[PDB]
A paper describes a structure:
Transient receptor potential (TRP) channel [name] is a polymodal cellular sensor that responds to moderate heat, cell swelling, shear stress, and small-molecule ligands. Transient receptor potential (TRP) channel [name] is a non-selective cation channel that is ubiquitously expressed in most tissues, including bone, skin, vasculature, heart, brain, lungs, liver, kidneys, and bladder. The channel is activated by warm temperatures (>27 °C), an increase of cell volume, endogenous ligands such as derivatives of arachidonic acid, and synthetic compounds. The cytoskeletal remodeling [name] [name] has been shown to suppress [name] activity.
To get insight into the gating mechanism of hTRPV4, we subjected the purified protein to single-particle cryo-EM in the presence of the 4α-[name] agonist. One population resulted in a 3D reconstruction identical to hTRPV4apo, while the second yielded a conformationally different 3.35-Å resolution structure hTRPV44α[name], with bulky densities revealing four 4α-[name] binding sites, one per subunit, at the base of the S1-S4 bundle. The hTRPV44α[name] structure, which was refined with C2 symmetry, displayed a slight deviation from the 4-fold symmetry observed for hTRPV4apo. Nevertheless, all four 4α-[name] binding sites in the hTRPV44α[name] structure were very similar and included residues S470, N474, S477, F524, N528, Y553, Y591, D743, I744, S747 and F748. In addition, we introduced the N474A, D546A and Y591A mutations in the 4α-[name] binding pocket and found various degree alterations in the 4α-[name] potency, likely reflecting the extent of the corresponding residue involvement into 4α-[name] binding. However, binding of 4α-[name] resulted in dramatic changes in the pore of hTRPV44α[name]. The narrow regions of both the selectivity filter and the gate were greatly expanded compared to the corresponding regions in the apo-state structure. The dramatic widening of the pore was confirmed by measurements of its radius using HOLE and suggested that hTRPV44α[name] may represent an open conducting state of hTRPV4. The opening of the channel in hTRPV44α[name] was also accompanied by movement of the intracellular skirt towards the membrane and transformation of the C-terminus that wraps around the 3-stranded β-sheet in hTRPV4apo into an α-helix, the characteristic changes previously seen during TRPV3 gating. In 4α-[name]-bound structure, [name] maintained a similar overall shape and [name] binding was nearly identical to those in hTRPV4apo.
Residue numbers in the entry:
A (entry chain B): 149 to 533, 547 to 641, 654 to 788
B (entry chain A): 543 to 591
C (entry chain C): 691 to 739
D (entry chain A): 395 to 493
E (entry chain A): 740 to 788
The structure:
């Protein structure tokens, strides 16, 4: 038997073809794991070739091929042989049997000895945005859970042979609960069984090893299976983790949304903040959904149950109170900075005999300015150990650059100080996050006016270069004299196009170039330039702004919620940690007393519900 | 509906009024440029294609 | 310094006349545009008063 | 799906690995490079304009247009626009610099 | 546009691009496995599939 012989033998699935080849293996000391009858491209052996080319669920060659490889000696080398191809790397024969949805041959490869923590680190087995087709897990236990196999994922845990535990991180750190989030699109058929096996593998891990929260295990990005659903945009498995009550007495620590008292139709409910809200001590789900969320359903993930009231609670506890402070302490500090430019008496080389308290009122004006210049600097310093974080850094530096030139007596002090004063009132325009109307038009003009004015810029530049160069070619050369209202000069490139659009908008009076070659064609091309351009191009832009205002009206509620969310977290992440721990939203609830009793020090949150149907 | 037939016709107005401004420039007449001014703007209206 | 005075005056004419006005008009265009249902109900409340 | 009349198909199944299914369509007359008539030329040109925009976006006819845009469409169009724009600027100079 | 450019090519270049692939489909009457030019579309199905 050559190499293409035996691969074609097991492909058709016909048994009794080798039928005593086991002496011929032992004759020339031939073994199945040797490179002779292994495909040189991938590395495929006899047993994978049977499984891909399976017939009606069973291949009778496999109990022969198990028994032939049993006698040769290679079983640990034969079951566990990775495809060394760079397009399937690491794929053992166990991955194929779990793939093809056959419980039968999985039971054989486990019993004869698999490598059930097998890392399929292939380019096929990568995420979709990383040049790959199907991500899962990179482990045989995760294949059973990602490809919807409840019976195999049970069997891979409670086997008599080598146990695949649910804790083992893969090549990039992902456990199986990280993997169930990574294959979950937020559709209906997806998030049906994903929420099932996220439960069925969480509950199984607690009825196994009861001291480890499997969800607390972080991958190699620091994220958790809740924060991985937060960053990658998912809503189907994101809602399920937050509203996860488990009524079993042994698995009660694995529960969020605790039920609570109910006096008639005033049913209470008690949500957890184990990862939704920390005071800077740890990573946060709420920081991920607001800042860096791979910009997906933020308007749907900042709404779920408790995130919607946790921003309402922080607003009227410290948020609104500190926000109006942050406005008027900044708006008064600009007026102080304004009057130090209008009434500044130096104009270079500062007046060393100040000697007036009115001069000393203004002298304290720069002290407040230098205080704001160094404090906007120091806030930006402790960030870097980002659009608008850098604009306050610009305003911070230019105060410090001015303050050095103030003491040096350099006349350029008054020049740089106005560059701070133009920029500081642009950040007064930034403090609109919460005033609904003003915050609405802030990010209108970002996408609607960098595009449409540019889109208006093409059709005007296509027209004007055509018409003007046609109409200055209509003019006469200097042959009689260097005057533009008679002849063409070097500035004819300039002064025509200046006079071109001026004649359209407001200079509708005569403004006529007499000395032309053909005045009968100049006036016709001028009439076309009135109507085939700007007049028609205005009616485009009215229809543009007429229709693209319906797009921002659709996003009316959905941009205000994110402005109001960035308002609160910027106030909250600027506070010191003991001040934030003074403002822990919710309350320290004792809710459970599981083994090593030491009851649950769990910072929860109350959400009351009024229901007459349940009643 | 002139989806492709508009600019195909507007390429034909251009393709004629280059030849017409050529031939009027060819023999005698100084009125070649009056038609050529149309050839400029139609040369730049057709960049909107 | 006319070199920087003409720069800041351009930022004035851009932000006030072009930007802030179009910020306001587009705001009017969608906020108080659909008050056909609202102002009908407020007048009936005013007429009953 | 049967054996004797399998050749009368146009969507063949190619490979599958969990939910990442791959099907393989045919271009018997959906795209011919000039040797025949072709549907993709008939859809764009010789079609009744009521459902023309709804017949382009079914299956490969949608993807085959953006695939030719990916191969030679975006390239030769961007060459075409700059060559016509550098044709009219030359024709611009023959207007103003006309003694 | 895309079909307009593709007509402007000669056949020699146009056969050289040839969007798709030359796959071997499946065995037919005359020996060969029905050699057809083909195009591949990949699709996910977490459903009853
Ligand atoms: C019970 C509730 C009360 C709690 C205590 C109140 C909080 C005290 C602390 C306080 O008010 O701090 C605010 C912080 C948050 C900022 O706004 C500062 C200014 C910037 C730019 O850095 C905008 C920010 O929102 C922002 O994004 C960053 C990075 C910090 C805040 C600004 C100071 C650090 C000076 C600041 O002070 C202000 O007055 C805001 C505007 C800046 C004006 C400067 C004032 C200094 C001299 C007038
Ligand atoms: C990797 C790719 C390989 C490339 C191999 C060769 C590519 C040739 C392919 C090429 O660029 O051919 C162009 C085509 C598309 C057109 O422009 C032709 C002109 C007309 C006239 O109605 C129609 C078009 O303008 C039009 O509307 C469309 C979409 C097609 C173009 C014209 C030819 C078919 C001769 C043409 O060639 C030109 O040079 C004209 C351009 C139009 C004026 C510009 C100046 C002329 C000379 C550059």
């Amino acid at each position: 038997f050559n190499r293409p012989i035996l691969f074609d033998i097991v492909s058709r699935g016909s048994t009794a073809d080798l039928d005593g080849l086991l002496p011929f293996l032992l004759t020339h000391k031939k073994r199945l794991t040797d490179e002779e009858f292994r495909e040189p491209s991938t590395g495929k052996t006899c047993l994978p070739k049977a499984l891909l080319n399976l017939s009606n669920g069973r291949n009778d060659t496999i109990p022969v091929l198990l028994d032939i490889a049993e006698r040769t000696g290679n079983m640990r080398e034969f079951i566990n042989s990775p495809f060394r191809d760079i397009y399937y790397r690491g794929q053992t024969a166990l991955h194929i049997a779990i793939e093809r949805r056959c419980k039968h041959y999985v039971e054989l490869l486990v019993a004869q000895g698999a490598d059930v923590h097998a890392q399929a680190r292939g380019r096929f087995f990568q995420p979709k945005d990383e040049g790959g087709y199907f991500y899962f897990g990179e482990l045989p236990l995760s294949l059973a859970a990602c490809t919807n196999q409840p019976h195999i994922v049970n069997y891979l845990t409670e086997n008599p042979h080598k146990k695949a535990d649910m804790r083992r991180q893969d090549s990039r750190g992902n456990t199986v609960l990280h993997a169930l989030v990574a294959i979950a699109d937020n559709t209906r058929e997806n998030t049906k069984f994903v929420t099932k096996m996220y439960d069925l593998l969480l509950l199984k891990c607690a009825r196994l090893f009861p001291d480890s929260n499997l969800e607390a295990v972080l991958n190699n990005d620091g994220l958790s299976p809740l924060m991985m659903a937060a960053k990658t945009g998912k809503i189907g498995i994101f809602q399920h983790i937050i509203r996860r009550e488990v009524t079993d007495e042994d698995t009660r620590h694995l529960s969020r949304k605790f039920k609570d008292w109910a006096y008639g139709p005033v049913y209470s409910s008690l949500y957890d903040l184990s990862s939704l809200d920390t005071c800077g001590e740890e990573a946060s789900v709420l920081e991920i959904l607001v800042y860096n969320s791979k910009i997906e359903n933020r308007h749907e993930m900042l709404a779920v149950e408790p995130i919607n009231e946790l921003l309402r609670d922080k607003w009227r506890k410290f948020g609104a109170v500190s926000f109006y402070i942050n406005v008027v302490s900044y708006l008064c500090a600009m007026v102080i900075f304004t009057l130090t430019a209008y009434y500044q008496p130096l104009e270079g080389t500062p007046p060393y005999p100040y000697r007036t308290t009115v001069d000393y009122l203004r002298l304290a004006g720069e002290v407040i300015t230098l205080f704001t210049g160094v404090l906007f600097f120091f806030t930006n310093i402790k960030d870097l150990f980002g659009s608008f974080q850098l604009l306050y850094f610009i305003y911070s530096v230019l105060v410090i650059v001015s303050a050095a030139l103030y003491l040096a007596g350099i006349e350029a002090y008054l020049a740089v100080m106005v560059f701070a004063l133009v920029l500081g009132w642009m950040n007064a325009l930034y403090f609109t996050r919460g005033l609904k109307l003003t915050g609405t038009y802030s990010i209108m003009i970002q996408k609607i006016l960098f595009k449409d004015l540019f889109r208006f810029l093409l059709v005007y530049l296509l027209f004007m270069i055509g018409y003007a160069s046609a109409l200055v070619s209509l003019l006469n050369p200097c042959a009689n004299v260097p005057t533009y209202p008679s002849c063409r000069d070097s500035e004819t490139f300039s002064t025509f196009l200046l006079d071109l659009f001026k004649l359209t908008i407001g200079m509708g009076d005569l403004e006529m170039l007499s000395s032309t070659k053909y005045p009968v064609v100049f006036i016709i091309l001028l009439v076309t330039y009135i109507i085939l351009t700007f007049v028609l191009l205005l009616n485009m832009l009215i229809a543009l702004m007429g229709e693209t205002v319906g797009q921002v009206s659709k996003e009316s509620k959905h941009i205000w919620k994110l402005q109001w969310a960035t308002t609160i977290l910027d106030i909250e992440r600027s506070f010191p940690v003991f001040l934030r721990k003074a403002f822990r939203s919710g309350e320290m609830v004792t809710v459970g007393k599981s083994s090593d009793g030491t009851p649950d020090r769990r910072w929860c949150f109350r959400v009351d519900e009024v229901n007459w149907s349940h009643w | 509906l002139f989806i492709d037939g508009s600019f195909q016709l507007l390429y034909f107005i251009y393709s004629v009024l280059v030849i017409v401004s050529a031939a009027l420039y060819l023999a005698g007449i100084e009125a070649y440029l009056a038609v050529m001014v149309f050839a400029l703007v139609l040369g730049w209206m057709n960049a909107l294609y």
